[PDB]
Design a protein around this nucleic acid. Structure first.
Lengths: 298, 198
DNA sequence: ATATATATATATATATATATATATATATATATATATATATATATATATATATATATATAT
DNA sequence: ATATATATATATATATATATATATATATATATATATATATATATATATATATATATATAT
């Protein structure tokens, strides 16, 4: 759609005014706010009970009274936390549900921004090229439905693997150097740690396909079809394909627990390797350690 | 490192004042500049000869003269391009070498930002949770050096592949619907187009 | 028996002087955003007293 | 067993005190645009030096 060339400037002019991230980054206090917020959620992404959040944010505010150039309050950091953690809720950076705060997508993106300024993990690498190589191999073999081509690909692949098995039974096995282990660990972190990035936008999409429904059930002050057509159908009445239909199939991957257990055990083994602690700092080795649990329990 | 809890605010206070991307996003003109630059480099990223860049930027500026909200004038589009395409160079968003301009990293990141505000491709997809599965498998089989484990895992993998081949020869073909082909194509694009970012 | 070394004339390259347009740097004025402060009202929580409903006991 | 006394708790009214929300004013700070001034680059005409090419004169 080449009318995008004109629509794009309007899109950006609107975004720079509304989207919470791009409003946050332009204020004269974005660094302080982002440093505080990252620290809050830095150690758990399941959401924070409100009282513990108040405690942690109040302690952090005291930790950054070194920036009392902004008159950071020295009297009662708990009251200042009560104020800041609500200012950030009315600004839609954080949202509190079921008694626990969370970080909306509009803060996920913003934090993805600043922490990629200085020292973002390397993407152009050996591991990324190998992974896209293999994925391009796999996707192509799955589209063209010709069975002869499929069986030929399986035959060539199994014969190629036979070479590796024969050479592995012998003593010509080779393993990664230290730096290559570091690189693959960094890569498989930079893939896995992205799965978590869309939940808080799937929820935003569902909480938006509902208003666009009750704003029509109430505009149809005279009509019935747009209600019975839905209710008589047992299908999800709030179905929202553009994200709902993607996320759902991902559940039909998570609940194949047999593979998830293998993933969890493999992650258990990798993080014990000597080179792991050099590739990833402490926090990264925590988040990547708890992936399966903090995916299922999200 | 625990001292990160304090060093982080200093790091950010420095970044918000120096990094070209953040300064650019903070200004009152960021949307127009970002749209212009994206349009420039969008069609073909190989470096842009300077004269063609002037041509394209001058043509684009014409399609925004009606935006009086930022005092866009009409006297001479080519001179305006000649002015601001270097105003950007002195701001380190673009750098000209060997006669061609380029987009420094401090603009790669910024464009990765605004374009990912609203309609970014999904990362929480079945394809990604198959790719990380297989990659974890490969990394595990490659790190632990015990040859017995290697031969055992190769044997199990080759036997699984043999089962797949036996079922495929029997005509038990299974292929992606469109619903899944779209997602896999989107994923393999969102991986491939990241190689160039560095 | 051959070109070679020279003068003559031509053509081009290089420097000087001046006119004109554009870029860079500095300084002032304006608009925007933030922060505080003021002022008001609302909302919330706690203390005391009163009135109602419920729970348990003794007699019927 | 049903209805009658005697505690116990619950619910409402009234009042005090604190914190939050809202609205507005004003101050201050910050970013951007405009105005002014001076330096740099390009073009034209003229003069001067160097090189190139051609014409006769030469001990090879």
């Amino acid at each position: 759609m080449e009318e995008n060339t004109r629509q794009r400037t309007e899109n950006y002019i609107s975004a720079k005014n509304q989207h919470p991230a791009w409003i946050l980054l332009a204020t004269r206090r974005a660094p302080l706010v982002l440093s505080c917020l990252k620290t809050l959620f830095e150690k758990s992404h399941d959401g924070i009970p409100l009282e513990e959040a108040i405690q942690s944010l109040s302690s952090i505010l005291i930790e950054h009274v070194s920036q009392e150039q902004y008159d950071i309050n020295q009297d009662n950091p708990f009251l200042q936390a009560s104020r800041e953690l609500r200012e950030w809720i009315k600004r839609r950076l954080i949202v509190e549900r079921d008694g626990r705060i969370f970080a909306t997508d509009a803060l996920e993106v913003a934090i993805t921004f600043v922490e990629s300024l200085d020292n973002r993990f390397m993407t152009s690498t050996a591991s990324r090229l190998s992974t896209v190589q293999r994925e391009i191999e796999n996707l192509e073999t799955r589209l063209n439905p010709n069975p002869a081509n499929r069986v030929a690909t399986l035959r060539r692949r199994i014969s190629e693997l036979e070479r590796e098995l024969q050479e592995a039974e012998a003593g010509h096995i080779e393993v990664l150097e230290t730096h290559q282990a570091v690189e693959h660990i960094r890569d498989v972190y930079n893939l896995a740690s992205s799965l978590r990035a869309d939940f808080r936008r799937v929820e935003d999409s569902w909480r938006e396909a509902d208003r666009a429904l009750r704003q029509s059930i109430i505009g149809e002050q005279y009509h019935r079809g747009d209600i019975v057509e839905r209710l008589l159908n047992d299908q999800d009445a709030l179905l929202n394909t553009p994200e709902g239909r993607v996320f759902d199939s991902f559940q039909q991957q998570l609940r194949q627990s047999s593979e998830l257990k293998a993933m969890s055990e493999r992650l258990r083994v990798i993080l014990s390797h000597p080179s792991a602690s050099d590739a990833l700092n402490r926090l990264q080795r925590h988040d990547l350690r708890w992936l399966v649990k903090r995916l299922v329990d999200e």
